[PDB]
PDB file of C-alpha atoms and ligand atoms in Angstrom:
ATOM      1  CA  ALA A   1       4.713 -23.770   4.352  1.00 17.22           C
ATOM      2  CA  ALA A   2       4.467 -20.062   3.432  1.00 19.27           C
ATOM      3  CA  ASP A   3       6.014 -18.031   0.649  1.00 16.64           C
ATOM      4  CA  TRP A   4       7.846 -15.847   3.223  1.00 16.32           C
ATOM      5  CA  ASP A   5       9.408 -18.824   5.081  1.00 20.26           C
ATOM      6  CA  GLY A   6      13.010 -17.960   5.895  1.00 20.23           C
ATOM      7  CA  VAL A   7      12.599 -14.280   5.028  1.00 17.73           C
ATOM      8  CA  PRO A   8      13.402 -12.439   8.229  1.00 15.91           C
ATOM      9  CA  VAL A   9      11.528  -9.530   9.766  1.00 13.97           C
ATOM     10  CA  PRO A  10      14.112  -6.685   9.766  1.00 13.49           C
ATOM     11  CA  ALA A  11      12.627  -4.640  12.619  1.00 14.31           C
ATOM     12  CA  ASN A  12      13.490  -5.147  16.318  1.00 14.04           C
ATOM     13  CA  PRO A  13      10.558  -6.367  18.445  1.00 14.83           C
ATOM     14  CA  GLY A  14      12.334  -5.325  21.666  1.00 11.67           C
ATOM     15  CA  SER A  15      14.563  -7.173  24.108  1.00 10.96           C
ATOM     16  CA  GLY A  16      12.920 -10.382  25.308  1.00 10.42           C
ATOM     17  CA  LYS A  17      10.411 -10.331  22.454  1.00  9.61           C
ATOM     18  CA  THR A  18       9.859 -12.122  19.168  1.00  9.24           C
ATOM     19  CA  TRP A  19       7.682 -11.616  16.083  1.00  5.46           C
ATOM     20  CA  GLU A  20       4.407 -13.507  16.067  1.00  5.15           C
ATOM     21  CA  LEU A  21       2.563 -13.966  12.775  1.00 10.42           C
ATOM     22  CA  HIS A  22      -0.780 -12.188  12.671  1.00 12.24           C
ATOM     23  CA  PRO A  23      -3.539 -14.208  10.977  1.00 11.56           C
ATOM     24  CA  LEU A  24      -4.313 -11.531   8.342  1.00 12.85           C
ATOM     25  CA  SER A  25      -1.043 -12.590   6.678  1.00 13.26           C
ATOM     26  CA  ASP A  26      -1.802 -14.080   3.244  1.00 12.10           C
ATOM     27  CA  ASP A  27       0.535 -15.511   0.586  1.00  7.55           C
ATOM     28  CA  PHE A  28      -2.293 -15.913  -1.936  1.00 10.45           C
ATOM     29  CA  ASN A  29      -1.800 -19.590  -2.725  1.00  9.12           C
ATOM     30  CA  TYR A  30      -5.397 -20.223  -3.708  1.00  7.13           C
ATOM     31  CA  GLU A  31      -7.674 -19.558  -6.665  1.00  6.07           C
ATOM     32  CA  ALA A  32     -10.176 -16.683  -6.281  1.00  6.85           C
ATOM     33  CA  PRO A  33     -11.596 -15.676  -9.651  1.00  5.27           C
ATOM     34  CA  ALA A  34     -12.465 -12.048 -10.300  1.00  7.59           C
ATOM     35  CA  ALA A  35     -16.240 -12.623 -10.072  1.00  7.05           C
ATOM     36  CA  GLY A  36     -17.128 -14.396  -6.803  1.00  3.92           C
ATOM     37  CA  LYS A  37     -13.610 -14.812  -5.403  1.00  3.97           C
ATOM     38  CA  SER A  38     -13.344 -17.783  -2.985  1.00  2.00           C
ATOM     39  CA  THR A  39     -14.126 -18.901   0.540  1.00  2.00           C
ATOM     40  CA  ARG A  40     -10.460 -18.440   1.521  1.00  2.00           C
ATOM     41  CA  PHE A  41     -10.380 -14.931   0.049  1.00  2.00           C
ATOM     42  CA  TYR A  42     -13.331 -13.861   2.175  1.00  2.00           C
ATOM     43  CA  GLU A  43     -11.814 -15.231   5.387  1.00  2.00           C
ATOM     44  CA  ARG A  44      -9.576 -12.138   5.399  1.00  2.00           C
ATOM     45  CA  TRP A  45     -10.634  -9.720   2.673  1.00  2.00           C
ATOM     46  CA  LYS A  46     -13.444  -7.742   1.180  1.00  2.00           C
ATOM     47  CA  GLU A  47     -13.552  -6.279  -2.328  1.00  2.00           C
ATOM     48  CA  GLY A  48     -13.270  -2.478  -2.472  1.00  2.00           C
ATOM     49  CA  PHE A  49     -12.463   0.042   0.229  1.00  2.00           C
ATOM     50  CA  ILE A  50     -13.210   0.720   3.916  1.00  2.00           C
ATOM     51  CA  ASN A  51     -16.512   2.310   2.829  1.00  2.00           C
ATOM     52  CA  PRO A  52     -18.530   2.684  -0.390  1.00  2.00           C
ATOM     53  CA  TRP A  53     -16.343   5.454  -1.872  1.00  2.00           C
ATOM     54  CA  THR A  54     -15.178   4.394  -5.333  1.00  2.00           C
ATOM     55  CA  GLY A  55     -11.928   6.357  -5.271  1.00  2.00           C
ATOM     56  CA  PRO A  56      -9.834   9.394  -6.153  1.00  2.00           C
ATOM     57  CA  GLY A  57      -9.122  11.041  -9.463  1.00  2.00           C
ATOM     58  CA  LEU A  58     -10.580   9.107 -12.403  1.00  2.00           C
ATOM     59  CA  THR A  59     -10.635   5.888 -10.317  1.00  2.00           C
ATOM     60  CA  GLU A  60     -13.631   3.674 -10.004  1.00  2.00           C
ATOM     61  CA  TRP A  61     -12.792   0.640  -7.867  1.00  2.00           C
ATOM     62  CA  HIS A  62     -14.401  -2.471  -9.307  1.00  2.00           C
ATOM     63  CA  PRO A  63     -14.634  -5.954  -7.754  1.00  2.45           C
ATOM     64  CA  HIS A  64     -13.824  -7.796 -11.015  1.00  2.00           C
ATOM     65  CA  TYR A  65     -10.444  -6.008 -11.262  1.00  2.00           C
ATOM     66  CA  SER A  66      -9.005  -8.033  -8.373  1.00  2.00           C
ATOM     67  CA  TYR A  67      -8.395 -11.788  -8.383  1.00  2.00           C
ATOM     68  CA  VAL A  68      -6.089 -14.378  -6.855  1.00  2.00           C
ATOM     69  CA  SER A  69      -4.300 -16.885  -9.083  1.00  2.00           C
ATOM     70  CA  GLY A  70      -0.962 -18.595  -9.628  1.00  2.00           C
ATOM     71  CA  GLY A  71       0.278 -17.689  -6.115  1.00  2.00           C
ATOM     72  CA  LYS A  72      -0.378 -13.947  -6.494  1.00  2.00           C
ATOM     73  CA  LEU A  73      -3.013 -11.376  -5.804  1.00  2.00           C
ATOM     74  CA  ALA A  74      -3.611  -9.434  -9.028  1.00  2.00           C
ATOM     75  CA  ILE A  75      -4.890  -5.882  -9.087  1.00  2.00           C
ATOM     76  CA  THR A  76      -5.692  -4.929 -12.674  1.00  2.00           C
ATOM     77  CA  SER A  77      -7.003  -1.928 -14.599  1.00  2.00           C
ATOM     78  CA  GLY A  78      -9.201  -1.103 -17.576  1.00  2.00           C
ATOM     79  CA  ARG A  79     -11.030   1.723 -19.275  1.00  2.00           C
ATOM     80  CA  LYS A  80     -14.607   2.239 -18.115  1.00  2.00           C
ATOM     81  CA  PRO A  81     -16.317   2.096 -21.517  1.00  2.00           C
ATOM     82  CA  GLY A  82     -17.511   5.412 -22.931  1.00  2.00           C
ATOM     83  CA  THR A  83     -15.923   7.483 -20.159  1.00  2.00           C
ATOM     84  CA  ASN A  84     -12.537   8.836 -19.057  1.00  2.00           C
ATOM     85  CA  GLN A  85     -12.702   6.740 -15.870  1.00  2.00           C
ATOM     86  CA  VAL A  86     -10.425   3.826 -14.953  1.00  2.00           C
ATOM     87  CA  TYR A  87     -11.717   0.647 -13.395  1.00  2.00           C
ATOM     88  CA  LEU A  88      -9.177  -0.515 -10.791  1.00  2.00           C
ATOM     89  CA  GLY A  89      -8.807  -3.395  -8.364  1.00  2.00           C
ATOM     90  CA  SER A  90      -8.974  -2.937  -4.619  1.00  2.00           C
ATOM     91  CA  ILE A  91      -9.251  -5.212  -1.603  1.00  2.00           C
ATOM     92  CA  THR A  92      -9.468  -4.282   2.087  1.00  2.00           C
ATOM     93  CA  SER A  93      -8.969  -6.322   5.265  1.00  2.00           C
ATOM     94  CA  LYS A  94     -12.159  -7.172   7.154  1.00  2.00           C
ATOM     95  CA  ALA A  95     -10.428  -6.362  10.454  1.00  2.00           C
ATOM     96  CA  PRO A  96      -7.939  -3.594  11.285  1.00  2.00           C
ATOM     97  CA  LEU A  97      -4.469  -3.617  12.813  1.00  2.00           C
ATOM     98  CA  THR A  98      -3.046  -1.581  15.665  1.00  2.00           C
ATOM     99  CA  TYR A  99       0.468  -0.625  16.706  1.00  2.00           C
ATOM    100  CA  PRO A 100       2.843  -2.156  17.491  1.00  2.00           C
ATOM    101  CA  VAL A 101       2.882  -4.101  14.250  1.00  2.00           C
ATOM    102  CA  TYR A 102       5.228  -4.844  11.344  1.00  2.00           C
ATOM    103  CA  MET A 103       3.355  -4.735   8.013  1.00  2.00           C
ATOM    104  CA  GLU A 104       4.992  -5.904   4.771  1.00  2.00           C
ATOM    105  CA  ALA A 105       4.157  -6.716   1.165  1.00  2.00           C
ATOM    106  CA  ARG A 106       6.176  -8.422  -1.528  1.00  2.00           C
ATOM    107  CA  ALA A 107       4.941  -6.958  -4.792  1.00  2.00           C
ATOM    108  CA  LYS A 108       5.624  -5.966  -8.399  1.00  2.00           C
ATOM    109  CA  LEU A 109       4.290  -2.535  -9.349  1.00  2.00           C
ATOM    110  CA  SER A 110       2.209  -2.175 -12.463  1.00  2.00           C
ATOM    111  CA  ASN A 111       3.979  -0.538 -15.400  1.00  2.00           C
ATOM    112  CA  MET A 112       1.578   2.363 -15.333  1.00  2.00           C
ATOM    113  CA  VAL A 113       1.294   5.978 -14.214  1.00  2.00           C
ATOM    114  CA  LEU A 114      -1.261   4.753 -11.681  1.00  2.00           C
ATOM    115  CA  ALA A 115      -0.306   4.356  -8.051  1.00  2.00           C
ATOM    116  CA  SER A 116       0.356   0.732  -7.008  1.00  2.00           C
ATOM    117  CA  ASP A 117      -0.522   0.746  -3.295  1.00  2.00           C
ATOM    118  CA  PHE A 118      -0.215  -1.248  -0.061  1.00  2.00           C
ATOM    119  CA  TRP A 119      -1.501   1.042   2.624  1.00  2.00           C
ATOM    120  CA  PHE A 120      -3.476   1.561   5.817  1.00  2.00           C
ATOM    121  CA  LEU A 121      -6.397   3.763   6.768  1.00  2.00           C
ATOM    122  CA  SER A 122      -8.492   4.308   9.884  1.00  2.00           C
ATOM    123  CA  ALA A 123     -12.249   3.725   9.677  1.00  2.00           C
ATOM    124  CA  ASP A 124     -12.868   7.484   9.857  1.00  2.00           C
ATOM    125  CA  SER A 125     -10.304   8.317   7.106  1.00  2.00           C
ATOM    126  CA  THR A 126      -8.237  10.607   9.353  1.00  2.00           C
ATOM    127  CA  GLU A 127      -5.066   8.506   9.797  1.00  2.00           C
ATOM    128  CA  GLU A 128      -3.107   6.770   7.026  1.00  2.00           C
ATOM    129  CA  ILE A 129       0.195   4.899   6.636  1.00  2.00           C
ATOM    130  CA  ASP A 130       1.531   4.256   3.096  1.00  2.00           C
ATOM    131  CA  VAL A 131       3.852   1.253   2.821  1.00  2.00           C
ATOM    132  CA  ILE A 132       3.912   0.729  -0.972  1.00  2.00           C
ATOM    133  CA  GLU A 133       2.897   3.802  -2.954  1.00  2.00           C
ATOM    134  CA  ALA A 134       4.733   3.996  -6.223  1.00  2.00           C
ATOM    135  CA  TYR A 135       4.307   4.658  -9.926  1.00  2.00           C
ATOM    136  CA  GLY A 136       5.892   2.018 -12.185  1.00  2.00           C
ATOM    137  CA  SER A 137       5.503   3.692 -15.604  1.00  2.00           C
ATOM    138  CA  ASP A 138       8.264   3.241 -18.183  1.00  2.00           C
ATOM    139  CA  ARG A 139       6.941   6.282 -20.146  1.00  2.00           C
ATOM    140  CA  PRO A 140       9.644   8.559 -21.447  1.00  2.00           C
ATOM    141  CA  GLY A 141       9.792  11.492 -19.007  1.00  2.00           C
ATOM    142  CA  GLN A 142       8.695   9.329 -16.040  1.00  2.00           C
ATOM    143  CA  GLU A 143      12.069   7.757 -15.355  1.00  2.00           C
ATOM    144  CA  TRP A 144      12.509   9.641 -12.057  1.00  2.00           C
ATOM    145  CA  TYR A 145       9.293   8.167 -10.649  1.00  2.00           C
ATOM    146  CA  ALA A 146      10.099   4.673 -11.920  1.00  2.00           C
ATOM    147  CA  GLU A 147      13.202   4.659  -9.702  1.00  2.00           C
ATOM    148  CA  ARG A 148      11.354   5.835  -6.564  1.00  2.00           C
ATOM    149  CA  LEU A 149       9.129   4.394  -3.767  1.00  2.00           C
ATOM    150  CA  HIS A 150       7.003   7.003  -2.000  1.00  2.00           C
ATOM    151  CA  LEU A 151       7.428   6.390   1.753  1.00  2.00           C
ATOM    152  CA  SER A 152       4.772   8.359   3.525  1.00  2.00           C
ATOM    153  CA  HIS A 153       1.768   8.732   5.783  1.00  2.00           C
ATOM    154  CA  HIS A 154      -1.131  11.177   6.047  1.00  2.00           C
ATOM    155  CA  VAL A 155      -3.188  12.778   8.735  1.00  2.00           C
ATOM    156  CA  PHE A 156      -6.406  14.533   7.744  1.00  2.00           C
ATOM    157  CA  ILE A 157      -9.121  16.763   9.014  1.00  2.00           C
ATOM    158  CA  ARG A 158     -12.214  15.741   7.032  1.00  2.00           C
ATOM    159  CA  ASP A 159     -14.207  19.007   7.186  1.00  2.00           C
ATOM    160  CA  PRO A 160     -12.908  21.566   6.294  1.00  2.00           C
ATOM    161  CA  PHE A 161     -10.595  19.198   4.430  1.00  2.00           C
ATOM    162  CA  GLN A 162      -6.888  19.386   5.268  1.00  2.00           C
ATOM    163  CA  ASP A 163      -4.155  16.869   4.373  1.00  2.03           C
ATOM    164  CA  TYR A 164      -0.661  16.604   5.850  1.00  5.15           C
ATOM    165  CA  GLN A 165       2.138  14.250   4.779  1.00  2.54           C
ATOM    166  CA  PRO A 166       5.909  14.571   5.087  1.00  2.00           C
ATOM    167  CA  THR A 167       7.392  16.215   1.997  1.00  2.38           C
ATOM    168  CA  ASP A 168      11.178  16.123   2.560  1.00  2.00           C
ATOM    169  CA  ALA A 169      13.317  14.623  -0.231  1.00  2.00           C
ATOM    170  CA  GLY A 170      13.839  11.329   1.586  1.00  2.00           C
ATOM    171  CA  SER A 171      10.106  10.585   1.335  1.00  2.00           C
ATOM    172  CA  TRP A 172      10.875   9.482  -2.242  1.00  2.00           C
ATOM    173  CA  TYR A 173      13.315   6.590  -1.916  1.00  2.00           C
ATOM    174  CA  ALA A 174      15.749   5.413  -4.610  1.00  2.00           C
ATOM    175  CA  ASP A 175      18.482   2.800  -3.966  1.00  2.00           C
ATOM    176  CA  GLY A 176      21.237   4.694  -5.817  1.00  2.00           C
ATOM    177  CA  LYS A 177      21.739   1.737  -8.169  1.00  2.00           C
ATOM    178  CA  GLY A 178      19.118   2.831 -10.747  1.00  2.00           C
ATOM    179  CA  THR A 179      16.678   0.054  -9.764  1.00  2.00           C
ATOM    180  CA  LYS A 180      13.284   0.405 -11.406  1.00  2.00           C
ATOM    181  CA  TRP A 181      11.012  -1.105  -8.803  1.00  2.00           C
ATOM    182  CA  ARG A 182       8.458  -2.252 -11.425  1.00  2.00           C
ATOM    183  CA  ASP A 183      10.972  -4.719 -12.907  1.00  2.00           C
ATOM    184  CA  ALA A 184      10.807  -7.311 -10.101  1.00  2.00           C
ATOM    185  CA  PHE A 185       9.111  -8.288  -6.883  1.00  2.00           C
ATOM    186  CA  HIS A 186      10.413  -6.257  -3.924  1.00  2.00           C
ATOM    187  CA  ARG A 187       9.446  -6.320  -0.306  1.00  2.00           C
ATOM    188  CA  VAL A 188       8.463  -3.138   1.440  1.00  2.00           C
ATOM    189  CA  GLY A 189       7.531  -3.014   5.099  1.00  2.00           C
ATOM    190  CA  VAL A 190       6.760  -0.585   7.897  1.00  3.29           C
ATOM    191  CA  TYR A 191       7.201  -1.039  11.605  1.00  5.33           C
ATOM    192  CA  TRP A 192       4.331   0.943  13.040  1.00  3.08           C
ATOM    193  CA  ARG A 193       5.839   0.923  16.531  1.00  2.60           C
ATOM    194  CA  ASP A 194       3.743   3.556  18.292  1.00  2.00           C
ATOM    195  CA  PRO A 195       1.768   6.667  17.342  1.00  2.00           C
ATOM    196  CA  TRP A 196       4.952   8.719  16.868  1.00  2.00           C
ATOM    197  CA  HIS A 197       7.346   6.235  15.255  1.00  2.00           C
ATOM    198  CA  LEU A 198       7.453   4.570  11.839  1.00  2.00           C
ATOM    199  CA  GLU A 199      10.333   2.630  10.278  1.00  2.00           C
ATOM    200  CA  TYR A 200      10.446   1.835   6.548  1.00  2.00           C
ATOM    201  CA  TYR A 201      12.238  -1.236   5.194  1.00  2.00           C
ATOM    202  CA  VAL A 202      12.986  -2.080   1.553  1.00  2.00           C
ATOM    203  CA  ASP A 203      14.215  -5.598   0.714  1.00  2.00           C
ATOM    204  CA  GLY A 204      15.154  -6.214   4.347  1.00  2.00           C
ATOM    205  CA  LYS A 205      17.006  -2.961   5.021  1.00  2.00           C
ATOM    206  CA  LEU A 206      16.007   0.044   7.104  1.00  2.00           C
ATOM    207  CA  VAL A 207      15.863   3.020   4.726  1.00  2.00           C
ATOM    208  CA  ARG A 208      13.892   5.717   6.612  1.00  2.00           C
ATOM    209  CA  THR A 209      12.727   6.487  10.127  1.00  2.00           C
ATOM    210  CA  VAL A 210       9.868   8.912  10.676  1.00  2.00           C
ATOM    211  CA  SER A 211       9.775   9.758  14.375  1.00  2.00           C
ATOM    212  CA  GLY A 212       8.366  12.557  16.577  1.00  2.00           C
ATOM    213  CA  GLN A 213       5.469  15.017  16.428  1.00  2.00           C
ATOM    214  CA  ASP A 214       7.355  17.521  14.253  1.00  2.00           C
ATOM    215  CA  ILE A 215       7.313  15.089  11.307  1.00  2.00           C
ATOM    216  CA  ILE A 216       4.334  12.855  12.202  1.00  2.00           C
ATOM    217  CA  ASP A 217       1.801  15.644  12.833  1.00  2.00           C
ATOM    218  CA  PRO A 218       3.317  19.107  13.152  1.00  2.00           C
ATOM    219  CA  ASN A 219      -0.066  20.791  12.438  1.00  2.00           C
ATOM    220  CA  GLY A 220      -1.863  18.988  15.286  1.00  2.00           C
ATOM    221  CA  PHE A 221      -4.490  17.304  13.111  1.00  2.00           C
ATOM    222  CA  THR A 222      -4.527  14.285  15.443  1.00  2.00           C
ATOM    223  CA  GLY A 223      -5.076  16.408  18.581  1.00  2.00           C
ATOM    224  CA  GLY A 224      -1.896  15.040  20.214  1.00  2.00           C
ATOM    225  CA  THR A 225      -2.762  11.360  19.669  1.00  2.00           C
ATOM    226  CA  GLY A 226      -0.521  10.575  16.663  1.00  2.00           C
ATOM    227  CA  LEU A 227      -1.006   7.568  14.390  1.00  2.00           C
ATOM    228  CA  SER A 228      -3.045   5.623  16.916  1.00  2.00           C
ATOM    229  CA  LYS A 229      -6.388   4.573  15.415  1.00  2.00           C
ATOM    230  CA  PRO A 230      -6.860   1.015  14.190  1.00  2.00           C
ATOM    231  CA  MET A 231      -6.136   0.856  10.459  1.00  2.00           C
ATOM    232  CA  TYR A 232      -7.402  -1.438   7.726  1.00  2.00           C
ATOM    233  CA  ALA A 233      -5.009  -2.960   5.198  1.00  2.00           C
ATOM    234  CA  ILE A 234      -5.749  -1.907   1.621  1.00  2.00           C
ATOM    235  CA  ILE A 235      -4.214  -3.192  -1.592  1.00  2.00           C
ATOM    236  CA  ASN A 236      -5.226  -1.241  -4.661  1.00  2.00           C
ATOM    237  CA  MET A 237      -4.308   0.836  -7.612  1.00  2.00           C
ATOM    238  CA  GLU A 238      -5.327   4.485  -7.773  1.00  2.00           C
ATOM    239  CA  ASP A 239      -5.583   7.132 -10.421  1.00  2.00           C
ATOM    240  CA  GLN A 240      -4.667   9.958  -8.031  1.00  2.00           C
ATOM    241  CA  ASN A 241      -5.779  13.563  -8.404  1.00  2.00           C
ATOM    242  CA  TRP A 242      -2.284  15.101  -8.169  1.00  2.00           C
ATOM    243  CA  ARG A 243      -1.542  13.098 -11.346  1.00  2.00           C
ATOM    244  CA  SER A 244      -4.745  13.053 -13.434  1.00  2.00           C
ATOM    245  CA  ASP A 245      -5.976  16.569 -12.532  1.00  2.00           C
ATOM    246  CA  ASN A 246      -2.678  17.643 -14.049  1.00  2.00           C
ATOM    247  CA  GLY A 247      -2.638  15.579 -17.238  1.00  2.00           C
ATOM    248  CA  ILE A 248      -1.055  12.262 -16.192  1.00  2.00           C
ATOM    249  CA  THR A 249      -3.471   9.326 -16.449  1.00  2.00           C
ATOM    250  CA  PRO A 250      -3.392   6.036 -18.344  1.00  2.00           C
ATOM    251  CA  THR A 251      -4.103   5.905 -22.058  1.00  2.00           C
ATOM    252  CA  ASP A 252      -6.472   3.362 -23.594  1.00  2.00           C
ATOM    253  CA  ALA A 253      -3.442   1.630 -25.155  1.00  2.00           C
ATOM    254  CA  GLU A 254      -1.771   1.235 -21.742  1.00  2.00           C
ATOM    255  CA  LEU A 255      -4.972  -0.022 -20.105  1.00  2.00           C
ATOM    256  CA  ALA A 256      -5.419  -2.585 -22.845  1.00  2.00           C
ATOM    257  CA  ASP A 257      -1.875  -3.979 -22.469  1.00  2.00           C
ATOM    258  CA  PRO A 258      -1.938  -7.115 -20.266  1.00  2.00           C
ATOM    259  CA  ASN A 259       1.818  -6.889 -19.761  1.00  2.00           C
ATOM    260  CA  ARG A 260       1.579  -3.433 -18.191  1.00  2.00           C
ATOM    261  CA  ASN A 261      -1.841  -3.038 -16.666  1.00  2.00           C
ATOM    262  CA  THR A 262      -1.538  -5.269 -13.610  1.00  2.00           C
ATOM    263  CA  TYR A 263      -0.001  -4.904 -10.125  1.00  2.00           C
ATOM    264  CA  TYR A 264       0.926  -8.214  -8.463  1.00  2.00           C
ATOM    265  CA  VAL A 265       1.260  -9.032  -4.782  1.00  2.00           C
ATOM    266  CA  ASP A 266       3.069 -12.240  -3.803  1.00  2.00           C
ATOM    267  CA  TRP A 267       2.270 -11.754  -0.106  1.00  2.00           C
ATOM    268  CA  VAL A 268       1.141  -9.466   2.642  1.00  2.00           C
ATOM    269  CA  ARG A 269       2.295 -10.373   6.132  1.00  2.00           C
ATOM    270  CA  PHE A 270       1.959  -8.814   9.525  1.00  2.00           C
ATOM    271  CA  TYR A 271       3.763  -9.503  12.812  1.00  2.00           C
ATOM    272  CA  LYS A 272       3.151  -8.511  16.407  1.00  2.00           C
ATOM    273  CA  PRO A 273       5.973  -8.253  18.923  1.00  2.00           C
ATOM    274  CA  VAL A 274       5.281 -10.590  21.862  1.00  2.00           C
ATOM    275  CA  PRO A 275       7.254 -11.833  24.856  1.00  2.00           C
ATOM    276  CA  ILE A 276       9.425 -14.890  24.288  1.00  2.00           C
ATOM    277  CA  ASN A 277       7.897 -17.898  26.137  1.00  2.00           C
TER     278      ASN A 277
HETATM  279 NA1   NA B   1      -4.650   9.330  16.628  1.00  2.00          NA
HETATM  280 NA1   NA B   2       2.315 -15.752  -3.022  1.00  2.00          NA
END
């Protein structure tokens, strides 16, 4: 049995096709302690990132800030002693995915100004899809962000560095009911259909379609190829520069609070559309 049994895939695989479970899918029903993890953990995952970079902003990704227990992957946070840096969990898939693929997590954001992330990046760091990217903080003055999921993707040129993502209002999704995403587990998925077409789904409903060169890559950073490179699955938290460069970063009191400082993932699952037998 799996934790997602009976929970449908909301995207359309095409006439005459069905969704086939990809083996990277993990519902985290095993024990993998922070130090050393477990055999099952390492069948799919590595600690850290796609490469040795330790992260943006004041982030320093740290292997002992991820663990699997009680049916959940936990990504936690803490102050790096004697510094302003933040130790954060991160895990990355050992193998990448390619379109067409539906990619979904069921997760509870941390109650922090940090980004809680479920996202995808090519080996060369030029192509990115962000499925969960959201900031759970209940701080006074952060209420707008607490009601929003950032639905986005990036294309980069590494040198000289350039970064494009969509920036229209609909890239920050709220349900209109005042839901604070941090308060419960929610499922967020993307159908990465082809290099020019993404569909975002929240709790089983299509909420945004990002389609065509004008929104995927209007500046031509992908040289006409779109979102086409294989991408690794990454589950992390981040202290991001657009926040901490500008005075928003966790306090020691927040980082010390076990009821706020952790981002939980019930499952990640991935499906490929395949012909019906
Ligand atoms: Na490409
Ligand atoms: Na689970």
